[PDB]
Design a protein around this ligand. Structure first.
Ligand SMILES: Nc1ncnc2c1ncn2[C@@H]1O[C@H](CSCC[C@H](N)C(=O)O)[C@@H](O)[C@H]1O
Length: 388
DNA sequence: CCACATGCGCTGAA
DNA sequence: GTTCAGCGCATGTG
């Protein structure tokens, strides 16, 4: 029939917001979504990716595949030979083995080359690390010389350069999608970002940059992210694809209240010691009030009203600990609620929870690293493919 | 200079 | 090596 098979390759895959968004819109597009491959080295993300996206996977105690050597328990550092031994002969090893075998996980982007990068990819995503780009962090940036984690962007450059020479034009990925944080468009980062856009044109791609807020895509979260959607020059001509004006999109509001889960056994914060003020609403529809003498870290010092939207969920720190005011008291958004906040489903969260391998704080960590799924649904909805 | 808005962060002690 | 409570300022707009 006219079912189009869509082969997706996810670099820096995390828990697969990209794959989730494609499977969500697939039926409406008459698409069949297929794993071409992925690159993710973070043990908790990989386990969780498998939990969320597997069909009929049955975990068991297994030896770790002998070439699974570049993986990380914290997402920043490679695991030692000893840490690898500790994963060997466990249920967790089976998740890592399954990711390799069934999802074609290549684990470490540095280990990706023209000899293992799949041909004929329809959608190639690269949500590269934001650490050195985020305004919340130290802003070391992405200068090539510095070899930073956000600088792993230049590994994507390497890969494209390599495959350009060995692949036919038609074997090159059809669509590319970058995601990163808003500070990528800062004055200090523009030089590097512009250098990247010029390389993409060098590689035969036509691109558009979008700065999109999750709050405009049916979410109760202020989260501004930069996307660079690219289309291969010739495929643009063959399809007649045109870039949509996604920055003009505004959907109906959603409030924090709309995703909250009722419980009788929540832990409430004792804030009796701290002076406070009326709630105040900013232009963005964040309704918040400060806690005085709480900490010296600004972003930690706010309680949010559930009748507005909330702040960007971060993996760690202040914005991973989102305090909301409810009738029963002030509490943090829970891991379930953080999954819902990134527009994953309750069933997605239950699958990760049921693995019994991911702590509550690690579940928030991987949610905070992710992308709100309906932003991606909106972007992927604009894509065109040539009829079979 | 100011007031305001906002953050897929970092790390050392236990 | 883990883990997370305690910790600040960058990058804006007006
Ligand atoms: N050398 C490397 N190889 C593969 N993955 C890497 C890497 N360095 C960092 N990463 C991963 O890149 C990710 C950036 S966050 C991306 C999250 C993803 N878009 C999602 O849906 O959740 C992190 O999960 C981090 O573990």
């Amino acid at each position: 029939d006219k079912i189009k098979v869509i082969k997706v390759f996810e670099a820096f895959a995390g828990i697969g917001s990209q794959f989730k968004a494609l499977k969500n819109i697939a039926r409406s597009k008459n698409w069949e979504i297929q794993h071409s491959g992925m690159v993710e080295w973070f043990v908790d993300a990989i386990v969780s990716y498998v939990a969320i996206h597997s069909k009929n996977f049955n975990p068991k105690i297994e030896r770790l595949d002998r070439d699974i050597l570049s993986i990380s328990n914290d997402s920043k550092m490679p695991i030692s030979e000893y840490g690898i031994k500790k994963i060997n002969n466990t249920i967790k090893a089976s998740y890592l083995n399954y990711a390799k075998k069934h999802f074609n996980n290549l684990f470490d982007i540095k280990k990706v080359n023209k000899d293992n990068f799949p041909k004929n990819i329809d959608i190639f995503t690269y949500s590269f690390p934001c650490q050195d780009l985020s305004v919340q962090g130290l802003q070391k940036g992405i200068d090539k010389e510095l070899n930073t984690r956000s600088g792993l962007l230049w590994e994507i450059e390497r890969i494209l350069e390599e495959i350009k020479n060995s692949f036919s034009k038609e074997e090159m990925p059809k669509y590319l999608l970058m995601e990163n944080v808003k500070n990528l468009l800062s004055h200090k980062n523009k030089k590097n970002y512009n250098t990247w856009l010029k390389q993409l044109e060098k590689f035969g791609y036509k691109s558009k940059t979008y700065l999109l807020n999750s709050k405009n895509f049916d979410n109760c979260q202020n989260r501004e992210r930069v996307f660079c959607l690219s289309i291969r020059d010739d495929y643009l001509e063959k399809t007649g694809f045109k870039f949509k004006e996604l920055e003009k999109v505004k959907n109906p509001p959603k409030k924090i209240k709309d995703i909250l889960v009722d419980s009788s056994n929540y832990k409430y914060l004792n804030l009796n010691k701290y002076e406070t003020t009326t709630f105040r609403e900013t232009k963005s529809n964040i309704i918040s009030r400060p806690l005085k003498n709480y900490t010296t870290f600004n972003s930690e010092n706010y309680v949010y009203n559930i009748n507005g939207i909330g702040p960007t969920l971060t993996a760690s720190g202040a914005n991973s600990r989102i305090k909301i005011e409810t009738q029963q008291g002030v509490r943090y958004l829970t891991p379930l609620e953080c999954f819902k906040y990134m527009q994953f489903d309750v069933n997605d969260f239950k699958k990760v929870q049921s693995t019994n391998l991911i702590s509550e704080n690690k579940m928030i960590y991987i949610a905070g690293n992710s992308i709100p799924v309906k932003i991606l649904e909106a972007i992927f909805n604009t894509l065109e493919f040539v009829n079979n």
